[PDB]
Design a protein around this nucleic acid. Structure first.
Lengths: 456, 217
DNA sequence: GGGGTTTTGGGGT
DNA sequence: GGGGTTTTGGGGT
DNA sequence: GGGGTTTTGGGGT
């Protein structure tokens, strides 16, 4: 039988093990300090300790362990943690709970929202509202009397996050003031873009309330929950003075990228207030070499929620994998290496609906209706190292991808205006660091671009 | 603007000059004063912002062991070294096995001569990070590959072999295999792209473990 | 037996 | 040892 | 003292 005590009511004198439930509002990633030790530091809150008289108040929780797996990975602020056997002591004025997981202490994590982060990523339902989504040791037991403590704290967790910012202005630094810090700092920003730099790394494009845009590398395995359009708190970043072409944040092994639970007032306001920025992209288009990635296209709103499929899967596994065989519409990202036919003037051909044949507008047709018959030779992160380039089509005779270039099909041998706009788009598409975000439809072994248009 | 990292500027200029060390700015080929972060199992030195692995020639260590007797190299951790004679090369490697590389390419610091300064050498610095894990630098190497790849593809792919429109516009009763969209990028031998034009420098170097046996069998 | 803790030799399971 | 710095892995640590 | 484990009483710190 365990007796749970509230944070502000826990004893500072009796150095005896105490137990408690609490809401997590901040945490480092679990990190190694030497050869046999791992630490995870977090800030916790509950009904008796959540606010200084305005800025948020909290207790600190330091978890010690001998293995990485014995420490909690906090991907989201707002979830709950239950700790057994912590000793409380005052550390520079703050109530600090210490727990040696490597000895007799344990923790268990509970989802405040319907699903946990991991469950959201894998689209799974939660076993029940009383089940921990992560915990230390081989087992975790929750008694009937704990159910009310949990449900009540969840109810409170939502009230707290919906009526207060929780992560107050004193817990982070404005991106446009980042360069003025001596050491590391925290940031709260909106993810504007998630670029797959390579097989292991994502490059996040961030923008905070001050309006400054910054980039930062985010390992796929470590932070698999990053999503475009969502707001996160980055715990511990430093300003990179060696980055000249773009504003970069450096993260450490102890750094953490944290999202917010649905009821978060701060996340909600920042999601609406912080709007997309393309200034970095527009400025880079004037340079011969851009160290900044530019996503030239935008997919139709109805696919915004459709998951992406790599070129590796699209061309090497699409006829063998059960899941990929049942689908005919996909979303993928890639960069264009070459565009065929070479002559931009031949991108638009005359099409005969009856004979199913297209022809060049040589002696300028009637031979059929004008259509785009463009073949892109692409490549992506998942195929970066191989000796292949892949064919992706923009054959608009049936309407798929008709507005891709924001230029209605026309005889490019006669319409100088149309030809020029397509020529400019050609240089942009083949330019280093330019990428395409597109939806494709599989027909007779080929992929045709559809519901996708250039935004530059 | 001004690049604060000596290493980052050096390695970036090398890649932006097709691995030709003679095309890199002469005002950058001056002696390198750098702090030793680690000495074993991996010898890593910093320039105050990043850490790179120096590759010592057999001549470099023998010369060292003469002008500085008993001062072991594998124990230089937390002390500084001054590389007076050095060169930069580009090598093809397995990035999955070599952490001081990216996209199977590595820029190596070839050391010919270096002297240790144990003289309470200091310098308050930020935590050194692997140059081959840096955003901008990874991007520079991607630029390099993109350029080689594009040149190879525009040389290899010719004749506008466009998918016949009927194959797609009239695909009812037609089934196909996606691997029909796979096009070879160059005239390679295997599955990896290797059609580069920089001449891969050779230069023999010592394995960090041989210099550990030479000092403590 | 062995950790971590202090119980500093000895419970229960 | 906590607002910090590993490398069972040097692209979760 | 108490876990998990098996040592089923007894080291070392």
């Amino acid at each position: 039988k365990y007796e749970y005590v509230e944070l502000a009511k826990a004893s500072l004198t009796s150095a005896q093990p105490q137990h408690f439930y609490a809401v997590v509002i901040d945490a480092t990633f679990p990190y190694k300090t030497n050869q046999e030790r791992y630490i995870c530091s977090l800030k916790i809150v509950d009904p008796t300790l959540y606010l200084k008289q305005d800025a948020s108040d909290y207790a600190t929780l330091v978890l010690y362990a001998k293995r990485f797996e014995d420490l909690p990975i906090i991907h989201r602020a707002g979830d709950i943690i239950r700790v057994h056997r912590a000793t409380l002591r005052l550390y520079n004025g703050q109530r600090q709970f210490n727990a040696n997981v490597f000895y007799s202490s344990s923790w268990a994590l509970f989802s405040t929202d319907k699903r946990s982060v991991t469950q959201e990523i894998n689209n799974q339902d939660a076993v029940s509202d009383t089940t921990p989504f992560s915990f230390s040791s081989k087992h975790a037991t929750i008694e009937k009397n704990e159910i009310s403590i949990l449900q009540n704290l969840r109810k409170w967790a939502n009230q707290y996050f919906s009526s207060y910012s929780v992560i107050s202005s004193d817990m982070y630094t404005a991106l446009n003031k980042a360069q003025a810090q001596k050491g590391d700092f925290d940031v709260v920003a909106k993810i504007l873009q998630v670029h797959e730099l390579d097989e292991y790394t994502n490059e996040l494009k961030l923008k905070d309330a001050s309006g400054q845009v910054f980039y930062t590398l985010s390992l796929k395995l470590k932070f698999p929950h990053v999503r475009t359009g969502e707001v996160v708190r980055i715990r511990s970043a430093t300003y990179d003075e060696t980055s000249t072409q773009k504003k970069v944040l450096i993260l450490s092994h102890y750094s953490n990228i944290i999202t917010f639970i649905q009821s978060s007032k701060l996340a909600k306001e920042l999601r609406a207030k912080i709007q997309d920025d393309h200034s970095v992209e527009v400025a880079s288009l004037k340079k011969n070499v851009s160290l900044n990635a530019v996503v030239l296209t935008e997919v139709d709103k109805k696919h915004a929620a459709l998951p992406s499929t790599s070129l590796q899967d699209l061309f090497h596994h699409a006829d063998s994998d059960k899941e990929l065989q049942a689908q005919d519409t996909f979303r993928t990202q890639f960069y264009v290496t070459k565009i065929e036919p070479s002559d931009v003037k031949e991108w638009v051909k005359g099409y005969d609906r009856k004979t199913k044949k297209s022809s060049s507008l040589k002696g300028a047709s009637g031979k059929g209706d004008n259509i785009f018959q463009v073949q892109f030779l692409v490549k992506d992160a998942s195929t970066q190292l191989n000796n292949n380039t892949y064919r992706v089509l923009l054959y608009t005779q049936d309407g798929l991808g008709a507005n891709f270039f924001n230029v209605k099909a026309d005889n490019l041998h006669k319409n100088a205006d149309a030809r020029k706009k397509l020529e400019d788009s050609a240089e942009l598409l083949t330019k280093f660091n330019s990428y395409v975000d597109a939806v494709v439809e599989r027909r007779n072994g080929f992929y045709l671009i559809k519901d996708t248009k250039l935004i530059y | 603007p001004q690049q604060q990292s000596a290493f980052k500027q050096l390695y970036t200029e090398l890649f932006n000059n097709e691995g030709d060390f003679s095309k890199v700015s002469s005002n950058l080929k001056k002696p390198l004063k750098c702090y030793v972060k680690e000495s074993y199992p991996h010898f890593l030195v910093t320039d105050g912002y990043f850490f790179v692995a120096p590759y010592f020639t057999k001549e470099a260590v023998n010369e060292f062991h003469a002008k500085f007797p008993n001062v072991n190299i594998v124990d230089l951790t937390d002390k500084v070294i001054v590389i007076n004679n050095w060169s930069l090369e580009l090598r093809r490697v397995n990035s999955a096995e070599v952490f001081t590389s990216y996209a199977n390419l590595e820029a190596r610091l070839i050391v010919h001569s270096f002297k240790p300064n144990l003289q309470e050498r200091l310098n308050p610095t930020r935590y050194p990070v692997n140059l081959f894990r840096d955003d901008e630098f990874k991007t520079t190497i991607q630029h390099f590959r993109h350029t080689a790849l594009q040149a190879a593809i525009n040389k290899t792919v010719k004749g506008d072999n466009l998918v016949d429109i009927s194959k797609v516009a009239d695909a009812a009763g037609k089934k196909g295999k996606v691997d029909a969209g796979i096009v070879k990028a160059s005239a390679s031998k295997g599955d990896e792209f290797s059609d580069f034009s920089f001449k891969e420098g050779n230069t023999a170097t010592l394995k960090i473990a041989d210099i550990f046996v030479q000092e403590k069998g």
